[PDB]
Design a protein around this ligand. Sequence first.
Ligand SMILES: NC1=NC(=O)C2=N[C@H]3C(S)=C(S)[C@@H](COP(=O)(O)OP(=O)(O)OC[C@H]4O[C@@H](n5cnc6c(=O)[nH]c(N)nc65)[C@H](O)[C@@H]4O)O[C@H]3NC2=N1
Ligand SMILES: NC1=NC(=O)C2=N[C@H]3C(S)=C(S)[C@@H](COP(=O)(O)OP(=O)(O)OC[C@H]4O[C@@H](n5cnc6c(=O)[nH]c(N)nc65)[C@H](O)[C@@H]4O)O[C@H]3NC2=N1
Length: 766
Amino acid sequence: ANGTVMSGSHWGVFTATVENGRATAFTPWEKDPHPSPMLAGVLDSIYSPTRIKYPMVRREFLEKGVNADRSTRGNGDFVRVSWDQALDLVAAEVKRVEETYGPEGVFGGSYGWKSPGRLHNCTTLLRRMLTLAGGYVNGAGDYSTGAAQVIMPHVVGTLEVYEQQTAWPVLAENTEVMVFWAADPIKTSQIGWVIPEHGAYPGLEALKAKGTKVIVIDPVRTKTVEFFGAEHITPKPQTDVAIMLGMAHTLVAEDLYDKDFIANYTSGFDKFLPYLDGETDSTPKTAEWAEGISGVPAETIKELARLFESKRTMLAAGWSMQRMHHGEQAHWMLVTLASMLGQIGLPGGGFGLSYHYSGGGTPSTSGPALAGITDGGGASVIPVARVVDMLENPGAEFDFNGTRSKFPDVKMAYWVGGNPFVHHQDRNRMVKAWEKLETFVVHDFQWTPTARHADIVLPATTSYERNDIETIGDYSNTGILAMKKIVEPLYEARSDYDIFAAVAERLGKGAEFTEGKDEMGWIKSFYDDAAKQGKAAGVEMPAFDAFWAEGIVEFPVTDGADFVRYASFREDPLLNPLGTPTGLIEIYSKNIEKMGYDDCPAHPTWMEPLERLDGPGAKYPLHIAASHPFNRLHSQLNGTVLREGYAVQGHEPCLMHPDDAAARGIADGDVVRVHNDRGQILTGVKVTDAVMKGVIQIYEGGWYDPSDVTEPGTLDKYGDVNVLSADIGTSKLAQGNCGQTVLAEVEKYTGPAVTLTGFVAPKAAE
Ligand SMILES: NC1=NC(=O)C2=N[C@H]3C(S)=C(S)[C@@H](COP(=O)(O)OP(=O)(O)OC[C@H]4O[C@@H](n5cnc6c(=O)[nH]c(N)nc65)[C@H](O)[C@@H]4O)O[C@H]3NC2=N1
Ligand SMILES: NC1=NC(=O)C2=N[C@H]3C(S)=C(S)[C@@H](COP(=O)(O)OP(=O)(O)OC[C@H]4O[C@@H](n5cnc6c(=O)[nH]c(N)nc65)[C@H](O)[C@@H]4O)O[C@H]3NC2=N1
C-alpha cells in the first residue's frame, strides 16, 4: 500500500501517509481547530520496541498451573506458544473457574480507557463472552468522578458530571467572571472518550477575545493560567472546602446573599446555617478560620466572594478535588455556594462540571445517536476501586450508598484495554494481594506493567489494523466517522473480537457471540439504525457504501447554541422539578441523614483527611499533585519517542520549587528518591516556581519498573506515582478512590546505579 487513509482515535481525526505497507505520518484533520502534539506518539506505538508480538505463557503457570509460585509474577520469565495452544488454555481456564466456583469466581470489570470504536470495544466484547460462559462479577462507577457522580443525584437529582453544559457562545455574550476551580482545560481537552472535536479551544479563545475576567484556583501555575494571564489563587491541596465555607460565611455576615433564590429553589439552608455560624461547634467558619487551614489570605477570600455576588459568574470545576478523602464534600459545597449567589439557570451564570472534559459546552447538533455491539445481558457488583479490598476479604461486608453487601470470592481476573498495575493505588499492597488469584489473563498491544504480570498474555491489534465506526464529539455529536484500516495486523496480533469469538467457539457458543455477522456486517447494522433514526428526525443521510466511500457525515446545528443549563427549573420550579425528594436543590439531605455515615454527614462539612500538607501532626512534608499527564493519555504512549521530550535522566519528571530543592541540597537534573511509609520510587527533578512551595508534581501513568519482584517494598526505577498512594474509600457513601491524597519526602539518590528495563520487551518475546 501507498496512499492516504482517514481514521481517528482518542486524540482526534487524522490522515495517515502509507508508504509500502508502513504508516509513515499522521496529519491532523483540516477541520480540527487545535490538534494534539501526541499524534506522533500514536503512530510510534504501532511499531515501538514494546509492541507485543506473540502469544506468551508465564513459565511457572505453564509448568504447574494452580500450584505455581505466584510471587514471581512480573519477572519476565515467559514462554512463546502457538495461538491454538493459547486459546485452548484460556477456554479451559474460563470453563474450570465457572464450573468449580460459579460466576462469582470470575472478575470481569476490566476498567480501562481502551480505544474508541462501536464494534471493536474490547471491554464490552469481554463481557459478551463471559456472559455466554455463565457470568462474572462487574465494577460500578469509575476512577474519574467516583464521589461526585454519587453525591450529585442526592443534591440536584441528576448525574450532572457527564451532561451538556451551558453553551460556549452563551458564556461569551453573558459571563463577566469565569472561574476555573481545580481545572486545567488547556491540558485536559486534548482527548475525548469518543473521537474529540477539540471544541473547548475556540470557546476559550472567545472568552479571551472579549476580555472576560478569568480566575484560576490551582496549586500549580498551569497552561490555563498562562493562556489567559489569569488571576491565580494557590490553596494548599485538599483545603478547597474550607475556602468555600469562608466565602459563604462572608456573604451571610455582610448580608449579601440571594435570600429569595434560597427560599424558593432550595431545601435545608436553615439546617446548614447553625453550622456555618458556629452555633453547633463553637467555630464560626470565617474567612480568617479558612486562611488558617488553606494558607490563602482572609481578605482575598472575602474579595472573591463579593465579586462573585456582584457580577454574572460561572463556576467551572474540575475533578481532582473529589479524587481525595471525603471527596463528596467538594462539589456538594460548590453547589451550595452557587445557590447562595443565586444565578443558577441564568445565561452565563451558575456552575459547570464538564467544561474541561470531552468538549462539554460545544453546541450539540440535531443528528441521531450511534449505538454499537452489546454484552447480551457475594455481590455481583463492587465499586471499581475496591478491587484490592475484595481480594483481601472475600465474604466480608461493605457499605455503599445506603446499602450493605458482601464481597465475592474471586479466583480469576481477565483484563483487556486497561492498566491496573499503573492506575490503581498502593502498588506494594496490590502486588501482595494479586497472589490470591489462580489465573490472570491480559490482552494489550504494548508491554505495560499489567501485561508483564499476567500468566497468559495475548497480543491485540491497534485500531489502525482494522475497520470500525464511531461518533465525533461526546457532547456535540458533530458527525460519524469511518475509522478505516491503515495497515495489516503486525506480527501475530489479532483483534480482541477475533480472540473472543474463538474462545466462544471453544465453549460451544460461537454463533451466539458473532450473531452470524462479520466485521462489515456489524458496522453496516449500526449505521443503518442511525440513518433510520435520522430520517424520523428529518436529518438526511446517505446509504452505507456511499458513506463508507466519503468516510464521514456531518450534522447541522439548530438550537444547540442557545442551551442554558437549569433554565426551565428557574422558570417554574413546581412545573419543572428536579429529581430529588423535595423537587428542589437539597443543601440538607434527609436521605443521607438516615444512612448514618460518620464520614458523610447530611450537609456539606469540613472534616480532616488521612493526611494533608501542614496538617496537625503530619509525618511527611510535601503534597504530591498526582494529576493527569500533559503528554500521555494516562499510561498510553509512555513506551514511545514522546518520552524523550520529558524524561529526566531517563526517569519520569518531578517538578519542585526552588526553596524546597535548596533545603535538601538538590539541583535541577538530579535523580531523587521519593518515599513515604507505603513505598519508594526514583524520579528526575526539574526545579521551577510553577509549583507552589510545599507541593511537588509527579503525573500519574508512569510505567512501574520494579528492581526485584520477589522483594517486598522494592524500589521502582522509573516513577509510577501510585507506589506512593493509599488505597482507601472517599467515604461509605461513594467508595471512590483517593489517588490525590498523598504526602511524601524527597532526597538525593545515593544507592547503586540502575538500568531501566520497562521500555524493551521481555527477552523471550523479542
Ligand atoms: N492530556 C490529557 N491526559 C490525560 O490523561 C487525560 N485524562 C482524561 C481523564 S479520564 C479525565 S477523568 C480528566 C481529568 O480531569 P481532572 O479535573 O480530574 O484533572 P487533573 O489533571 O487530575 O487536575 C486538574 C487540576 O487540579 C489541580 N489540583 C490538584 N489538587 C488540587 C486541589 O486540592 N485543589 C485545587 N484547587 N486544585 C487541585 C491540579 O494541579 C490540576 O491542574 O482529564 C482527561 N483529559 C486528559 N488529558
Ligand atoms: N494517583 C492517581 N491520580 C489520578 O488522577 C488518576 N486518574 C485515574 C483515572 S480518572 C483513570 S480513567 C485511570 C486510567 O487508567 P486506564 O487503565 O484506563 O489507563 P490507560 O494507560 O488508558 O490503559 C489503557 C490500556 O488499554 C490498551 N488498549 C488500547 N486499545 C486497546 C484495544 O483495542 N485492545 C486492547 N486489548 N487493549 C487496548 C492501551 O494500550 C493501554 O495499555 O487512572 C486512574 N489513576 C489515577 N491515579
